[PDB]
Design a protein around this nucleic acid. Structure first.
Lengths: 206, 82, 127, 104, 143, 37, 63, 63
RNA sequence: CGGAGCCAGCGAGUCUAACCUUGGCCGAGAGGUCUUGGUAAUCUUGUGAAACUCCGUCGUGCUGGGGAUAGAGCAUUGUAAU
């Protein structure tokens, strides 16, 4: 791969990992599988950020938040708890451990496991609380796919923070278990169940 | 031949630059060796006053090195009193 | 005199001044190697202005970084921005313009923070 | 480390100084169970007794329990000075006491 | 291409140099090591009860080689812990000065640190040689 | 303690000048802390 | 499960009591000839893609 | 109780494709403290293969 | 919890007084001693702050979370600390 030896040695593992086209320490963004056509334009991660830790100012425009990396965006919604406000490096290491777990749990493409958990846990339609004339019924609206991404990431981080609290099992193992049971619909995870609940309330209330 | 450093301070920039430039012109017109006007940072003394508001003050500082005998130093220090 | 370029790089009151001279291919940050950055997580971020262009651009230059102010993340972004700025300024002033445009294009297409100073400052709290 | 496995030979609940001690916690935090004895007190006592405190209280021989009791009734003779004990500079006697668990 | 302390990692240098000082043993080690915690902002004494003092001295010597000179109050500031005050929040608390004084006397008695006429503990050139040699040996552990 | 005009109510006790916040804004245009922002 | 694929073509404004839901005109993605009026909860720009379930349901107005 | 807790580690770790800190306490024989001692011991033996190591969680693989 | 790494900025400082204190020794510490620097972008100061990063101890058990309450002594400012 034509190494160039410097006086300050940039080490051989880093030169092999980022000279060869793998876009992480062990992973790649060239293997990303998006199912839904609405989720093609709002998940987009094609720029190789070898740490997935960025000082993003994506929160000024509603469309700019969709250009936040969904690995980084999942890392950001991991930083939700009051004990964790302002801890992004912690959640980046959580993501790195989680991608390692999804490797060792026989999913060779853990980033595709993440994107498929984004896809398979998005409630397409939900209900809003219309006025209705006193007895306020709930009417099925068809939530936006950007809000479907927001909603799926929120449900996954809530389910992982519920599961990792009050057990020996770590945040990385619980979040990997949720992403694997949610990348393909199995109803043993959190956001699959709550996606099903929101969609059955939407179907019952249209 | 005495080497004296003059440390000047002021609140307004125009009179302080005028005093410094007069020092430069008069010490230049009769061949005194000197360091230029070194301009210290303007310190911002503030008081948070009773929501809340803020009162400010800019303080500007220069200093000029001079090397001159006693007569010229005394006449410069007397005349430049403003 | 060894041909050197002196170039700043800033991040959140963290100024890293870089001295890119003609040397062995040696890179130091605060007299500490680029292999050893104080956070382990942000490490490859400092490698992001390095491997985005290539490694034979570096054997000609001994690179100095000296840092004041900031935090932990702020100094990392400061030093990687300073590495990118000192590299493109070396390849501007001494090396020809076209290689500088190629290095600035490689930096700009991935992360414009490495060449352009940032603005996310804490505002005055509006009394 | 090395998994050093023992064919039984440990007791579930020991009793020392007329008080039950659980022989499954670390020896510091198993002797913390009794009154008048906290974390750092049991820690310094078992360091003067040179007890491996990463070992649990089931893997502890009664000779070390005798050493711990000897440091209980002799804290000031085993180089644990007056700042570390409960009742320093008494009014009844003028001495330094470490009031034990069931003797309060 | 000088093998020195400036090239090795922090914790690896402290582990290696503390291991050399343990295998040597030729320092001034006090008797209140098993008794006294390193700072008043702590609850428990350090877990390496027979060997936290050498870790302390390795941290001190590494911190001295990298700079001009140190004092006792500076190393009290360096170790400083967030202390709980019960119902009150954490506050910064400096460490004990006796551990600093005995570490610097142990490393000055062996001829590694020395008092500099700016009132400061600086690394001696024999201490420079010794720390650069053991840092070279730490690098040779990595081959 | 107000040592100027016996005006303890709202002393500005900082730096020993010791003027009440009523009379401090009377004498505000003698020291120099004035309205900029 | 019929996954209806949809296209945002014309926004109609902001409706709902709280002023949160959006009436959206929809070009049906699989068959161009269907133009539906739907109710969307969330941020939507022009020429976006939606994922509906029923192409046949239309709701007049909301309160 | 040494020969009827310890070797079940040697049966279960080659069974499980993924061996970490809290997917090895879960067998309900051991504590969470000595589990990492068994982890390092199987590192030394070779049934456990290191993937990545952190001071709170360590990822491994069977042999 | 136990170690290690050690990242800022706004301020503020003594006269006809005891301010900010660097350093060195003693003390488990609290603190004490001896001085020294600074009327200040100079010394305190690079205020080596905390959160943070890493590695070990813990192993979900009102637990090694919590620290309320209470006992014993030891020091500091204050005439006087109940």
């Amino acid at each position: 791969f034509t190494p160039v030896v410097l006086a300050t040695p940039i080490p051989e593992e880093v030169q092999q990992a980022q000279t060869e086209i793998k876009l992480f320490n062990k992973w790649s963004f060239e293997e990303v599988e998006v199912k839904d056509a609405s989720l093609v334009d709002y998940v987009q991660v094609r720029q190789p950020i070898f740490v997935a830790h960025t000082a993003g100012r994506y929160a000024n425009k509603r469309f700019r938040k969709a250009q936040c990396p969904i690995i980084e965006r999942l890392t950001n919604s991991l930083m939700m708890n009051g004990r964790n406000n302002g801890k992004k490096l912690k959640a980046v290491r959580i993501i790195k451990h989680t991608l390692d777990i999804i490797n060792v749990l026989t999913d060779q493409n853990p980033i595709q496991v993440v994107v498929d958990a984004i896809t398979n846990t998005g409630p397409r339609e939900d209900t809003t609380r219309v006025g209705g004339g006193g007895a306020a019924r709930r009417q099925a609206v068809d939530v936006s796919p950007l809000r479907r991404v927001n909603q799926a990431i929120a449900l996954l981080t809530i389910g992982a923070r519920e599961a990792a609290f009050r057990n020996i099992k770590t945040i990385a193992e619980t979040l990997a278990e949720e992403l694997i049971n949610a990348a393909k619909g199995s109803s043993t995870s959190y956001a699959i169940k709550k996606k099903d609940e929101l969609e059955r309330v939407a179907k019952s209330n249209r | 031949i005495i080497k004296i450093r003059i440390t000047l301070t002021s609140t307004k920039v125009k009179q302080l630059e005028n005093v410094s430039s007069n020092i430069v012109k008069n010490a230049e017109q009769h061949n005194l060796v000197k360091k230029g006007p070194v301009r210290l940072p303007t310190k911002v003394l503030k008081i948070s006053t009773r929501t809340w508001e803020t009162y400010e003050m800019r303080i500007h500082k220069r200093y000029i090195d001079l090397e001159a005998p006693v007569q010229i130093v005394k006449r410069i220090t007397q005349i430049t009193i403003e | 005199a060894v041909p050197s370029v002196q170039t700043f790089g800033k991040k959140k009151s963290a100024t890293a001044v870089a001295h890119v001279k003609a040397g062995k291919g040696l890179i130091k940050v605060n007299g500490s190697p680029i292999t050893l950055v104080e956070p382990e997580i942000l490490r490859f971020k400092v490698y992001e202005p390095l491997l985005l262009v290539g490694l034979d651009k570096f054997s000609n230059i001994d690179i100095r970084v000296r840092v004041t102010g900031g935090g932990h993340v702020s100094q990392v972004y400061a030093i990687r921005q300073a590495i990118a700025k000192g590299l493109v300024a070396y390849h501007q002033k001494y090396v020809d313009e076209q290689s500088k445009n190629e290095l600035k294009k490689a930096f700009t297409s991935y992360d414009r923070t490495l060449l352009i100073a940032d603005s996310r400052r804490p505002e005055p709290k509006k009394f | 480390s090395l998994v050093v496995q023992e064919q039984g030979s440990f007791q579930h609940i020991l009793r020392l100084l007329n008080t039950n001690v659980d022989g499954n916690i670390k020896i510091v935090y198993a002797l913390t169970t009794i009154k008048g004895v906290g974390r750092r007190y049991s820690n310094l006592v078992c360091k003067k007794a040179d007890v491996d405190l990463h070992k649990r209280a089931g893997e502890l021989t009664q000779e070390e329990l005798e050493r711990i009791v000897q440091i209980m009734q002799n804290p000031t003779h085993y180089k644990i000075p007056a700042w570390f004990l409960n009742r320093q500079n008494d009014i009844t006697d003028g001495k330094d006491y470490h009031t034990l668990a069931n003797n309060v | 291409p000088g093998v020195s302390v400036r090239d090795v990692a922090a914790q690896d240098f402290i582990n290696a140099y503390a291991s050399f000082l343990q295998r040597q043993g030729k320092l001034e080690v006090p008797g209140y090591v098993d008794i006294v915690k390193t700072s008043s902002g702590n609850e428990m004494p350090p877990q390496d009860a027979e060997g936290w003092f050498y870790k302390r001295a390795a941290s001190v010597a590494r911190h001295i080689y990298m700079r001009k000179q140190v004092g006792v109050g500076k190393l009290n500031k360096l170790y400083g812990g967030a202390k709980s005050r019960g119902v009150r929040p954490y506050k910064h608390i400096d460490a004990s000065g006796s551990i600093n004084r005995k570490v610097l006397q142990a490393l000055e008695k062996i001829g590694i640190v020395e008092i500099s006429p700016k009132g400061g503990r600086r690394i001696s050139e024999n201490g420079q040689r010794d720390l650069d040699r053991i840092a070279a040996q730490t690098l040779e552990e990595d081959e | 303690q107000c040592r100027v005009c016996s005006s303890h109510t709202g002393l500005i006790r900082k730096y020993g000048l010791n003027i009440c916040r009523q009379c401090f804004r009377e004498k505000a245009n003698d020291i120099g802390f004035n309205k900029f922002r | 499960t019929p996954v209806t694929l949809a296209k945002v073509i014309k926004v109609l404004g902001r409706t709902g009591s709280r002023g949160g839901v959006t009436q959206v005109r929809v070009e049906f993605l699989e068959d161009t000839s269907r133009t539906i009026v739907r109710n969307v909860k969330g941020p939507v720009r022009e020429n976006d893609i939606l994922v509906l379930m029923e192409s046949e349901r239309e709701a007049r107005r909301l309160r | 109780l040494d020969q009827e807790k310890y070797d079940r580690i040697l049966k279960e770790v080659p069974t499980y494709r993924y061996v970490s800190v809290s997917v090895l306490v879960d067998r309900l024989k051991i504590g969470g403290s000595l589990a990492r001692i068994a982890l390092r011991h199987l590192e030394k033996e070779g049934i456990i293969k290191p993937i990545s190591k952190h001071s709170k969680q360590a990822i491994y693989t069977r042999a």
